[PDB]
């Protein structure tokens, strides 16, 4: 993981991409969709270099922290070519007014759409997207490990080393595309700052999802998926 | 005023730094302190290169969106040397057990402590800190062009500072990334803090208060 090159990081990340799922009232469809995506999210996470090096506990923690962000950046990505609409699924393309049908949703909708617009304006590349998504996975929960064990310190150091490698990969992509050094740093910063907005959206989204909340605790579901046996 | 050098930007940012305020029931004192810090925050913002070029509408918007983040990073910054504690003020140094005293605070408390621990492990520098804080101001409401131009300028300035500390180009973009990802955590803390504080908000807009402070 730490010995991979930039080209090999990109390659692994592209390979790891989950499928685009299809929708099979509107909130039910959306909720079913998210539920199905989660499973594929875990498989993806397990294929992000370094992730399986972590403890199962930490793996759960990172996903528990990042799952909505991860859903969102994927949505924003899929939607980038559909101005004013969100492509939840290839057969579930929703607009703003469709969002009003659900109490509390348009505000999130409008935020998602603006982020999609912002990606469009930057001409975000696929190679860039997967690096960002991976960053989200490894970063979002890293400051909330409520533990100061030696093992935990080791985990966090590993996480930041992998994060460093992904940064190296982003710059590499940008240099390859002919960007000057100054333009590289600037673009790196612009993209990373978008993650702050995605976090923000995620917290607003969690509130919203809670206003409409019975359920198994997410942790145990994540472990079940994550904690697989080795029997194949 | 994109025309400043990196050195000049850093200088302007360091000089713009607000004072450390004092306290004279915990929540009353905290609220009173934050309320007083806000005015100084407004005057700090006015001295951030590029900020006054914005419309007042936009100045107000940035401030309304960024104020708690700004209070937090300052708090974390002055709490670095107080392991296990948060220095809200020189005379208001509180531990997590003191935070547990207010329903819903200890979670945010622990997060602020983790952030201070991260800053400590990163050996965050003053010059870095003032750029970060400037980035928070200009980035927290943007979701435009002049704002991005100034943001780009602050990115250049951070890089400049890291180059001048002797870091390889690889180390530079690695550290730049590390610092900007911390801002995700700060936004997160702000979101959670805002949830906490409202658990209820005024009818009168904060925008009006901010507008009046700029006078
Ligand atoms: C961003 C986004 C949303 C969404 C989320 C929050 C909102 O307030 C509005 C829309 N939705 C709708 C939605 C998202 C998440 C939902 O979570 C319900 C909770 N549970 C099921 C989801 C998996 C893990 C947590 C348990 C329910 C509905 C998406 C569906 C698929 C997708 O790829 C992206 C999204
Ligand atoms: C980080 C931080 C907090 C805080 C708030 C909530 C938490 O759960 C944890 C810490 N507090 C406590 C606190 C922060 C903000 C508060 O805002 C409520 C009133 N606001 C009036 C309208 C907006 C401008 C600021 C005041 C009330 C209390 C701080 C005080 C000073 C300071 O420099 C930093 C902080």
Residue numbers in the entry:
A (entry chain A): 307 to 330, 341 to 529, 532 to 550
B (entry chain B): 307 to 330, 341 to 459, 472 to 527, 530 to 545
Text from the published report:
We solved x-ray crystal structures of antiestrogens in complex with Y537S and WT ERα ligand binding domain (LBD) to understand the structural basis of differential transcriptional antagonistic efficacies. In addition, a new hydrogen bond is observed between S537 and E380, which was previously computationally predicted for the Y537S-BZA structure. BZA, RAL, and RU39411 show the greatest burial at 379.75, 377.87, and 325.21 Å respectively. These molecules engaged a new S537-E380 hydrogen bond that enforced a well-ordered antagonistic H12 conformation that corresponded to significant surface area burial within the AF-2 cleft.
The pro-oncogenic cellular activities of estrogen receptor alpha (ERα) drive breast cancer pathogenesis. Ligand-dependent transcriptional activities depend on the association of coactivator proteins with ERα to form functional complexes. SERMs and SERDs elicit a structural rearrangement of the ERα LBD to sterically preclude binding of coactivators in the activating function-2 cleft.
